[PDB]
Amino acid sequence: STGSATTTPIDSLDDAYITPVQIGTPAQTLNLDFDTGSSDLWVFSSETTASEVDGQTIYTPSKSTTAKLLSGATWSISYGDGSSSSGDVYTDTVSVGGLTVTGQAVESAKKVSSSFTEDSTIDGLLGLAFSTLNTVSPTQQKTFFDNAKASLDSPVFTADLGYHAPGTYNFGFIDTTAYTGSITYTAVSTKQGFWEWTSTGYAVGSGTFKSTSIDGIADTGTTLLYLPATVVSAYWAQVSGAKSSSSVGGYVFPCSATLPSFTFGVGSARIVIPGDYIDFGPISTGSSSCFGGIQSSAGIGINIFGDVALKAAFVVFNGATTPTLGFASK
């Protein structure tokens, strides 16, 4: 089997991408944030505290003839940005782009943190990291990809995120028309539960490539590119007037600037992020200070190849017995 679904930016900045997902019988379609940095499929629901729902579409398990309470199971998650959610668990039929999993754990939110409530466009998350990170207790549950893997034509999914435009998530096949050149594959460590890999270095604009190992994670659920402070300083030094602002929370730059590209290495291959992809717009409406899309990871504990980096590539998440990642230009 295969599946193919379009993923759409939630706003004009590509802050996140939503993909429609059919849950239950008859189908209830919710727009979920596919997140290769986490491993829970959780949704706003008829069980979510009413004051914490503000425009999201909800899953109502009582209206699904295939829903079954997973007795005794609870979940609770906290994300790198400080947001969180928790609740109970149903199993139900879940389909993405024509690919159907029966008995998928659908984690129904009883509580969500304010950042979720305040974003009416995201109805939940669909985690695509390794199932060892799934938070369901006392019986950990499998991700949608883990449940589908054995049925897929090939045990892979691909992320093809658009710049200011829709893109595609495919399951079970590699669309050879979706990229240019070849796909360069690179080793993955699953020891932390992430799609963790080592970039071979970077360049700023037309500058020389610096060969240096940068361990980080491929994370579709993170908006920006978070890298070591040395690398980030080297980038923003090429933008007149750019500076790190403690009060804003990162590097800002004059909105009148033209940003240089940023290149990252994948083995001997190179992925070029155009400068425009690094512009996240005014820090507040009407400001001439703009927020940068490359930020320091120093306060995180891990480097994160988020959407800013991934949208410059066609990315293969290869879930074979020994997982690997592939990157191609497009």
Short mmCIF file of C-alpha atoms in Angstrom, two decimals:
data_model
loop_
_atom_site.label_atom_id
_atom_site.label_comp_id
_atom_site.label_asym_id
_atom_site.label_seq_id
_atom_site.Cartn_x
_atom_site.Cartn_y
_atom_site.Cartn_z
CA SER A 1 0.00 0.00 0.00
CA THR A 2 0.84 3.69 -0.26
CA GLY A 3 -0.58 7.02 0.79
CA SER A 4 -0.12 10.58 -0.43
CA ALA A 5 -1.45 13.74 1.24
CA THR A 6 -0.97 17.44 0.63
CA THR A 7 0.39 19.47 3.53
CA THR A 8 -0.49 23.19 3.68
CA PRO A 9 1.16 26.07 5.58
CA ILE A 10 -1.04 27.42 8.35
CA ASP A 11 -0.10 31.05 7.67
CA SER A 12 1.93 33.34 5.40
CA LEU A 13 5.19 32.59 7.28
CA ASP A 14 5.08 28.77 7.08
CA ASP A 15 4.96 28.61 10.88
CA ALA A 16 3.67 25.05 10.59
CA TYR A 17 2.00 22.74 8.08
CA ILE A 18 -1.33 20.91 8.39
CA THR A 19 -2.32 17.69 6.67
CA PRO A 20 -5.88 16.30 6.60
CA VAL A 21 -6.35 13.00 8.43
CA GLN A 22 -9.49 10.85 8.45
CA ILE A 23 -10.34 9.39 11.87
CA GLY A 24 -13.18 7.01 12.66
CA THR A 25 -16.28 5.72 10.93
CA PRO A 26 -17.82 7.69 9.33
CA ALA A 27 -14.64 9.66 8.79
CA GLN A 28 -14.00 12.75 10.88
CA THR A 29 -11.38 14.82 9.06
CA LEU A 30 -8.97 16.75 11.29
CA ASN A 31 -6.01 18.86 10.15
CA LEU A 32 -2.95 17.58 12.00
CA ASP A 33 0.62 18.82 12.34
CA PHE A 34 2.85 15.95 11.15
CA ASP A 35 5.78 15.99 13.56
CA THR A 36 8.91 13.90 12.94
CA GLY A 37 10.15 15.09 16.36
CA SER A 38 7.48 13.37 18.46
CA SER A 39 5.59 10.10 18.59
CA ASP A 40 2.01 10.77 19.76
CA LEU A 41 -1.07 11.11 17.56
CA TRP A 42 -3.25 13.40 19.66
CA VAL A 43 -6.35 15.40 18.79
CA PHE A 44 -8.67 18.04 20.07
CA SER A 45 -11.80 16.17 21.01
CA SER A 46 -15.25 16.22 22.55
CA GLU A 47 -13.36 15.56 25.82
CA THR A 48 -11.19 18.69 25.63
CA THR A 49 -11.97 21.27 28.33
CA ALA A 50 -14.40 23.59 26.58
CA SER A 51 -12.56 26.81 27.46
CA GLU A 52 -9.43 25.39 25.80
CA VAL A 53 -11.10 24.88 22.40
CA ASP A 54 -11.20 27.98 20.19
CA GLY A 55 -12.09 27.10 16.60
CA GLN A 56 -10.39 23.71 16.21
CA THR A 57 -12.21 20.77 14.68
CA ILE A 58 -12.74 18.06 17.28
CA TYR A 59 -12.79 14.27 17.21
CA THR A 60 -15.91 12.84 18.86
CA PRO A 61 -15.27 9.14 19.55
CA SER A 62 -18.90 8.47 20.51
CA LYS A 63 -19.85 9.24 16.88
CA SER A 64 -17.35 6.71 15.46
CA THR A 65 -18.61 3.14 15.22
CA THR A 66 -15.01 1.86 15.15
CA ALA A 67 -13.74 3.78 18.20
CA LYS A 68 -12.88 1.80 21.31
CA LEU A 69 -11.68 3.23 24.61
CA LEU A 70 -8.21 1.88 25.38
CA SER A 71 -9.04 1.07 28.97
CA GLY A 72 -6.78 2.62 31.59
CA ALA A 73 -4.52 4.37 29.10
CA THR A 74 -3.49 8.00 29.58
CA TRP A 75 -0.98 10.27 27.91
CA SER A 76 0.80 13.52 28.70
CA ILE A 77 3.37 15.31 26.59
CA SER A 78 5.52 18.41 26.81
CA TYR A 79 7.20 19.82 23.72
CA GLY A 80 10.47 21.67 23.27
CA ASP A 81 8.65 25.00 22.96
CA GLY A 82 7.07 24.63 26.41
CA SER A 83 3.62 23.59 25.18
CA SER A 84 1.83 20.51 26.50
CA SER A 85 -1.32 18.40 26.34
CA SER A 86 -2.76 15.31 28.02
CA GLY A 87 -5.75 13.00 28.08
CA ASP A 88 -7.02 9.47 27.47
CA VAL A 89 -6.82 7.11 24.51
CA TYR A 90 -9.05 5.44 21.95
CA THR A 91 -8.19 3.05 19.18
CA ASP A 92 -9.81 3.84 15.84
CA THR A 93 -9.30 3.67 12.10
CA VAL A 94 -7.00 6.39 10.79
CA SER A 95 -6.34 7.16 7.13
CA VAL A 96 -3.82 9.54 5.58
CA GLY A 97 -3.92 10.21 1.86
CA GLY A 98 -5.59 6.86 1.14
CA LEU A 99 -3.43 4.76 3.51
CA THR A 100 -5.51 3.16 6.28
CA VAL A 101 -4.43 1.83 9.68
CA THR A 102 -6.94 0.03 11.86
CA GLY A 103 -6.52 0.04 15.62
CA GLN A 104 -4.41 3.19 15.70
CA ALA A 105 -4.04 4.83 19.11
CA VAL A 106 -5.81 8.20 18.91
CA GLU A 107 -4.90 10.22 21.99
CA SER A 108 -7.87 12.39 22.95
CA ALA A 109 -6.94 15.64 24.68
CA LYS A 110 -8.64 16.49 27.93
CA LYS A 111 -6.26 19.44 28.44
CA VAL A 112 -4.10 21.46 26.06
CA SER A 113 -1.78 24.36 26.82
CA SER A 114 -2.60 27.89 25.74
CA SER A 115 -0.46 27.88 22.60
CA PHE A 116 -2.59 25.05 21.18
CA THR A 117 -5.87 26.76 22.10
CA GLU A 118 -4.66 29.98 20.49
CA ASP A 119 -3.91 28.27 17.16
CA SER A 120 -7.26 27.50 15.60
CA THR A 121 -5.69 25.95 12.48
CA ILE A 122 -4.08 22.89 14.16
CA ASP A 123 -6.46 20.17 15.35
CA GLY A 124 -3.72 17.97 16.82
CA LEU A 125 -0.39 16.33 16.07
CA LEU A 126 0.58 13.16 14.22
CA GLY A 127 3.96 12.01 15.52
CA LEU A 128 6.45 10.41 13.12
CA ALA A 129 9.49 9.95 15.38
CA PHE A 130 10.27 6.52 16.82
CA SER A 131 7.63 4.80 18.92
CA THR A 132 10.00 4.60 21.91
CA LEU A 133 9.04 8.26 22.57
CA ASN A 134 5.29 7.62 22.69
CA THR A 135 3.88 8.82 26.01
CA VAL A 136 0.90 6.47 26.47
CA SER A 137 0.92 4.76 29.86
CA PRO A 138 0.89 2.02 31.03
CA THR A 139 1.14 0.46 27.56
CA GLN A 140 3.18 2.48 25.07
CA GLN A 141 1.55 2.78 21.65
CA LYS A 142 2.90 2.75 18.09
CA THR A 143 2.97 5.65 15.67
CA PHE A 144 0.86 5.69 12.52
CA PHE A 145 3.97 4.96 10.46
CA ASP A 146 5.03 2.07 12.70
CA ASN A 147 1.55 0.54 12.39
CA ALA A 148 1.47 1.01 8.61
CA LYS A 149 5.06 0.03 7.86
CA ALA A 150 4.62 -3.69 7.23
CA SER A 151 1.81 -3.01 4.74
CA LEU A 152 3.63 -0.32 2.78
CA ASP A 153 5.28 -1.07 -0.56
CA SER A 154 8.54 0.23 0.96
CA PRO A 155 9.02 1.10 4.67
CA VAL A 156 9.52 4.81 4.09
CA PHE A 157 7.79 8.16 4.18
CA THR A 158 8.85 11.39 2.53
CA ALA A 159 8.46 15.05 3.45
CA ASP A 160 8.33 17.61 0.64
CA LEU A 161 7.45 20.87 2.38
CA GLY A 162 6.74 23.97 0.32
CA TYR A 163 8.09 27.49 0.72
CA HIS A 164 5.00 29.68 1.09
CA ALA A 165 3.11 26.93 -0.74
CA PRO A 166 1.62 23.47 -0.16
CA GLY A 167 3.76 20.35 -0.25
CA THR A 168 3.36 16.59 0.14
CA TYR A 169 3.77 13.75 2.61
CA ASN A 170 4.04 10.35 0.88
CA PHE A 171 3.97 6.95 2.58
CA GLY A 172 5.40 3.78 1.09
CA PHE A 173 7.08 5.12 -2.05
CA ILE A 174 9.62 7.65 -3.31
CA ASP A 175 8.25 9.98 -6.00
CA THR A 176 11.22 10.22 -8.34
CA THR A 177 9.62 13.23 -10.10
CA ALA A 178 9.63 15.31 -6.90
CA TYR A 179 13.36 16.11 -6.68
CA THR A 180 16.36 16.95 -8.83
CA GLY A 181 19.64 15.09 -8.97
CA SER A 182 20.12 12.17 -6.59
CA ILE A 183 19.10 11.47 -3.00
CA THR A 184 22.04 11.33 -0.59
CA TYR A 185 21.44 8.98 2.31
CA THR A 186 23.04 9.44 5.71
CA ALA A 187 23.15 7.44 8.93
CA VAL A 188 20.57 7.82 11.71
CA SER A 189 20.89 7.23 15.44
CA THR A 190 17.62 6.25 17.12
CA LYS A 191 19.14 6.32 20.62
CA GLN A 192 17.15 9.42 21.61
CA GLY A 193 14.05 8.39 19.67
CA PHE A 194 14.58 11.00 16.95
CA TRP A 195 15.63 11.01 13.31
CA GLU A 196 19.08 12.09 14.47
CA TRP A 197 21.87 12.49 11.92
CA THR A 198 25.16 14.35 11.41
CA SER A 199 25.50 17.12 8.86
CA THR A 200 28.96 17.45 7.32
CA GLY A 201 29.13 21.26 7.55
CA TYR A 202 27.83 24.56 6.29
CA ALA A 203 28.39 27.66 4.18
CA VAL A 204 27.00 31.20 4.45
CA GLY A 205 25.96 32.78 1.16
CA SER A 206 28.68 32.40 -1.46
CA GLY A 207 31.29 31.74 1.22
CA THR A 208 33.54 28.73 1.52
CA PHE A 209 32.12 25.51 2.91
CA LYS A 210 33.21 24.74 6.48
CA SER A 211 33.61 21.00 7.04
CA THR A 212 32.43 20.25 10.57
CA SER A 213 30.16 17.60 12.07
CA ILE A 214 26.80 18.95 13.28
CA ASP A 215 24.61 16.36 15.01
CA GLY A 216 20.93 17.23 14.93
CA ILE A 217 17.41 16.00 14.30
CA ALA A 218 15.16 16.21 11.25
CA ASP A 219 12.04 17.74 12.81
CA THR A 220 9.05 18.72 10.68
CA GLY A 221 7.26 19.94 13.81
CA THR A 222 9.79 22.72 14.51
CA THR A 223 9.52 25.88 12.43
CA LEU A 224 13.10 27.14 12.47
CA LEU A 225 16.68 25.92 12.04
CA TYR A 226 18.51 25.71 15.39
CA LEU A 227 22.29 25.31 15.18
CA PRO A 228 25.37 25.90 17.35
CA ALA A 229 25.99 29.49 18.40
CA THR A 230 29.24 29.64 16.38
CA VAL A 231 27.44 28.73 13.14
CA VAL A 232 24.53 31.07 13.81
CA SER A 233 26.85 34.00 14.62
CA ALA A 234 28.74 33.39 11.38
CA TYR A 235 25.46 33.54 9.44
CA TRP A 236 24.06 36.73 11.01
CA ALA A 237 27.44 38.50 10.81
CA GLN A 238 26.77 38.69 7.05
CA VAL A 239 23.55 40.69 7.59
CA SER A 240 24.18 44.37 8.34
CA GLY A 241 22.43 45.38 11.53
CA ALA A 242 21.50 41.86 12.62
CA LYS A 243 21.93 41.13 16.32
CA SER A 244 20.83 38.73 19.02
CA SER A 245 18.10 40.29 21.15
CA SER A 246 17.60 38.83 24.61
CA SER A 247 14.27 40.64 24.91
CA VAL A 248 12.88 39.31 21.63
CA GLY A 249 14.39 35.86 22.14
CA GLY A 250 16.86 35.45 19.30
CA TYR A 251 18.46 37.02 16.28
CA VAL A 252 16.60 39.88 14.62
CA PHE A 253 17.56 41.80 11.53
CA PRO A 254 16.44 44.92 9.66
CA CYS A 255 13.45 44.14 7.52
CA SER A 256 15.16 46.12 4.71
CA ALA A 257 17.98 43.55 4.52
CA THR A 258 18.50 41.01 1.75
CA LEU A 259 19.38 37.73 3.49
CA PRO A 260 22.15 35.41 2.26
CA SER A 261 21.52 31.74 1.64
CA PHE A 262 22.64 29.04 4.05
CA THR A 263 24.04 25.70 2.86
CA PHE A 264 24.19 22.53 4.92
CA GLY A 265 26.07 19.35 4.07
CA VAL A 266 24.61 15.86 3.72
CA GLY A 267 27.62 13.65 3.14
CA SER A 268 29.32 15.14 0.09
CA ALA A 269 26.05 16.72 -1.08
CA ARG A 270 24.85 20.24 -0.31
CA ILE A 271 21.35 21.59 0.40
CA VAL A 272 20.95 25.34 -0.19
CA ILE A 273 18.40 27.26 1.87
CA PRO A 274 17.59 30.49 -0.03
CA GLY A 275 17.85 33.67 1.99
CA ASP A 276 14.13 34.38 1.68
CA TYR A 277 13.37 31.15 3.59
CA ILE A 278 15.17 32.67 6.62
CA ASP A 279 12.86 35.70 6.90
CA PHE A 280 10.14 35.28 9.53
CA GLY A 281 8.85 38.83 9.23
CA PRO A 282 8.29 41.66 11.67
CA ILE A 283 8.67 40.82 15.35
CA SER A 284 5.35 42.64 15.93
CA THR A 285 2.91 44.15 13.47
CA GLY A 286 4.41 47.20 11.79
CA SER A 287 7.92 46.74 13.18
CA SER A 288 10.96 47.17 10.95
CA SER A 289 12.80 44.53 13.02
CA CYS A 290 12.36 41.06 11.53
CA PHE A 291 12.80 37.67 13.19
CA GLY A 292 15.48 35.33 11.87
CA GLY A 293 14.85 31.77 10.75
CA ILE A 294 18.27 30.49 11.88
CA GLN A 295 18.66 30.61 15.67
CA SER A 296 21.02 29.26 18.30
CA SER A 297 20.41 25.81 19.76
CA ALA A 298 22.59 26.62 22.79
CA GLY A 299 19.60 26.63 25.16
CA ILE A 300 17.99 23.47 23.72
CA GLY A 301 20.55 20.69 24.14
CA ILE A 302 20.20 19.48 20.54
CA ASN A 303 20.48 20.98 17.08
CA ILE A 304 17.22 20.97 15.12
CA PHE A 305 16.85 20.85 11.33
CA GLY A 306 13.31 22.21 11.36
CA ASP A 307 11.09 23.38 8.53
CA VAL A 308 13.45 26.18 7.39
CA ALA A 309 16.01 23.50 6.48
CA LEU A 310 13.69 20.65 5.48
CA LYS A 311 11.58 22.74 3.07
CA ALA A 312 14.71 23.30 0.96
CA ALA A 313 14.89 19.53 0.33
CA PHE A 314 13.03 16.38 -0.57
CA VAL A 315 13.52 14.31 2.58
CA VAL A 316 13.29 10.52 2.85
CA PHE A 317 12.59 9.00 6.26
CA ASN A 318 13.72 5.42 5.66
CA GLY A 319 12.27 3.14 8.34
CA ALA A 320 14.05 -0.03 7.31
CA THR A 321 15.51 -2.25 10.03
CA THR A 322 18.45 0.15 10.17
CA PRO A 323 16.83 3.56 9.54
CA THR A 324 18.49 6.21 7.40
CA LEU A 325 17.65 9.70 6.14
CA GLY A 326 17.86 10.86 2.54
CA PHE A 327 18.09 14.42 1.23
CA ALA A 328 17.75 15.68 -2.34
CA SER A 329 17.56 19.15 -3.81
CA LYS A 330 14.33 20.04 -5.59
#
